[PDB]
A paper describes a structure:
HGbRL from M. infernorum is a putative globin-coupled sensor of 274 residues, consisting of an N-terminal globin domain and a C-terminal Roadblock/LC7 domain. N-HGbRL consists of seven α-helices, helices A–H, lacks helix D and forms a dimer. It displays a typical bacterial globin fold except for a very untypical feature — its helices E and F unexpectedly fuse into an elongated helix. In other words, both the proximal and distal sites of a single globin fold are constituted mainly by two separate subunits, representing the first ever site-swapping example in the globin family.
Further optimization subsequently yielded crystals of the closed form, also in the same space group C2 but with only a subunit in the asymmetric unit. Tyr28(B10), meanwhile, has been driven away to hydrogen-bond to both the N of Arg51(E9) and Lys52(E10), as well as to W1. The closed form of N-HGbRL is hence the first globin structure with Lys–His hexacoordination. In the closed form, meanwhile, Lys48(E6)–Arg51(E9) are untangled and no longer form the first turn of helix E, which tilts towards the haem and binds to it. Loop CE is also pulled towards helices B and C, stabilized by new hydrogen bonds between Arg39(C5) from helix C and Phe42–Ile44, between Gly50(E8) from the unravelled turn of helix E and Ile46, and between Arg29(B11) from helix B and Glu47. The side chain of Trp59(E17) has two alternate conformations in the closed form — one with an occupancy of 0.6 facing the solvent and another of 0.4 flipping 180° inwards — but in the open form it flips inwards, appearing to act as a switch between the two forms. Once the ligand dissociates, loop CE may tend to assume the closed conformation as it is stabilized by the interactions, absent in the open form, with Arg29(B11), Arg39(C5) and Gly50(E8) that pulls Lys52(E10) towards the haem. A signature of this subgroup may be haem hexacoordination or shielding with a residue at site E10 or E11, instead of E7, such as Lys52(E10) in N-HGbRL and Leu57(E11) in HMP.
Residue numbers in the entry:
A (entry chain A), B (entry chain A): 1 to 138
The structure:
Amino acid sequence: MTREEIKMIQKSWLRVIDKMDEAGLLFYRRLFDVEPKVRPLFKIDIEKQGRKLMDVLNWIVLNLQDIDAALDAARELARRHVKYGVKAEHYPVVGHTLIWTLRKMIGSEWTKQLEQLWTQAYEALAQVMIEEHHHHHH
Amino acid sequence: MTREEIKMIQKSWLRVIDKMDEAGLLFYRRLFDVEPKVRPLFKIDIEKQGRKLMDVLNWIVLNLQDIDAALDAARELARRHVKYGVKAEHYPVVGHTLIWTLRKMIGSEWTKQLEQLWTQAYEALAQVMIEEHHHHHH
Ligand code: HEM
Ligand code: HEM
């Protein structure tokens, strides 16, 4: 997840916080209208102090903030790559070669699911590093 | 990222480690055949001690292990949800309602990019929690 991405997530979260109570009511009312069967899981007076919307939003945001902080190490790695002469345009071919090599080495135990997981993991990490390359790239 | 997912990633990583040197050579040879222009970024004798494949694989795996450990808190949250009477089948509607509410509250500042980021973040967290529900679900 890139810095640009977490920034726009945080900004939209702040927008909801600004209208927190209104947003929370809207969430409950929509939830119970689309799926009345979950209504009994909540207090009869749940609108008065329940915070379902924020419970979910805050968990997401707090988790993403932890992941973003951890990715500072990847940004440090990218800065080293700048110094190695590596450019943002080089990341796709390394990724393709990574998957090509894994497919070869794992053989008949390689699966579409594995290919997807490794592809998504590489692509996400590469996107963080590419974002850093762009900042130093003169 | 679910426990099932990180397990299959780790298993495939162990398979590569078993043939680490062979895999590393294959990676370099493929890389330089598809993109000879990156060859000068590497030592003339890079096959002898370079570890590009493992450098990338290990970074991915070590990052994913940290995220998996952090997700123990989400599994704890899911266990509480089991006790609240929540079922795996309830997660989609909460997610749809989350996005519906954000779209409403954010209005003309809501974007397809924001919708995608929030959708993916919710879906991923929900998948971790659903996996836990399945274990307790009698
Ligand atoms: C997600 C992608 C990548 C990851 C996780 C990664 C990881 C690493 C790591 C851990 C090192 C060891 C040195 C250090 O920590 O600074 C390294 C070195 C290096 N990487 Fe990467 N790298 C990635 C992408 C690339 C790309 C796209 C290239 C382009 C050719 C590249 C070329 C190099 C070079 C030239 C070195 C130093 C020379 C060497 O180790 O032989 N890397 N990389
Ligand atoms: C990713 C999805 C979800 C997240 C992050 C989440 C988060 C939370 C949190 C932080 C709490 C406060 C209590 C605690 O920590 O145990 C809570 C309570 C609760 N949640 Fe969730 N939840 C999610 C999905 C759901 C779903 C799908 C339902 C189904 C209706 C649900 C119903 C409830 C109920 C009934 C409570 C306790 C009663 C209340 O707080 O009013 N949650 N949830």
